[PDB]
């Protein structure tokens, strides 16, 4: 997997993004601290749905881009040692086998 390097105290971006049709309806994704499981996420930092953000885990956790233009990157706000690791971003496009599923490996220096 491609990795992030980012220091102790500030915030780490992890680019996520999809092709959103002109005036599309928004595929619903979720962000997890994890490799990509089977369903949904493992370790959930960020869900949305067809309309808007659905869960956020903590207010350190943002989608920095914006979700209505299919950029679901996330920002990870003043990050410790203990953020480092493997990071899913999975765009659930419908039907079974069709998500798209992105893992990065997030390193602190």
Not at 22 to 27: A, D, E, P, Y
Not at 65 to 92: F, P
Request: net charge positive; glycine share 8%; charged share 25%.
């Amino acid at each position: 997997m491609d990795g992030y390097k980012v220091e102790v105290g500030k915030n780490a971006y992890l680019p996520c993004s999809y092709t959103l049709p002109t005036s599309g309806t928004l595929v619903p994704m979720c962000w997890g601290k994890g490799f990509c499981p089977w369903s949904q996420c493992t370790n959930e930092l960020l869900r949305t749905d067809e309309r808007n953000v659905t869960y956020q885990k903590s207010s350190r956790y943002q989608l920095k881009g914006d979700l209505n233009k299919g950029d679901v990157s996330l920002i990870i706000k003043n990050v410790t040692l203990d953020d480092h690791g493997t990071y899913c971003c999975r765009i659930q496009f419908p039907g079974l086998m069709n998500d798209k599923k992105l893992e990065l490996k997030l390193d602190i220096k």
